[PDB]
Design a protein around this ligand. Structure first.
Ligand SMILES: [Cl-]
Ligand SMILES: [Cl-]
Ligand SMILES: [Cl-]
Ligand SMILES: [Cl-]
Length: 99
């Protein structure tokens, strides 16, 4: 799609049977979601949060649909004030900023 920026660029995402929303955030390196669960192994990761650091779970090779487009990549699961799609998945989408 072509998404204008008059409002926050929030899109529908889906991971397995979990339909959620998230912000397309070109200021974020990584993708972090609070309200989904994934099975199996993960690696711990620190991200910045208001105490200093927040521990999240890094899951690799996750199939995710973003605004109806399927990609595969890394998803962090843990506390976040909003669900964020970062550049790691936007690069998998072939997303660009255009003006
Ligand atoms: Cl808004
Ligand atoms: Cl959407
Ligand atoms: Cl699922
Ligand atoms: Cl990735």
């Amino acid at each position: 799609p072509q998404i204008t920026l008059w409002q926050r660029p929030i899109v529908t995402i889906k991971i397995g049977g979990q339909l959620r929303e998230a912000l397309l955030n070109t200021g974020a390196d990584d993708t972090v979601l609070e309200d989904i669960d994934l099975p199996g192994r993960w690696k711990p990761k620190l991200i910045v949060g208001i105490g200093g650091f927040v521990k999240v779970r890094q899951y690799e090779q996750v199939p995710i649909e973003i605004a109806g487009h399927k990609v595969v990549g890394t998803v962090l699961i843990g506390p976040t004030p909003s669900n964020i799609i970062g550049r790691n998945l936007m690069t998998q989408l072939g997303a660009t900023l255009n003006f």
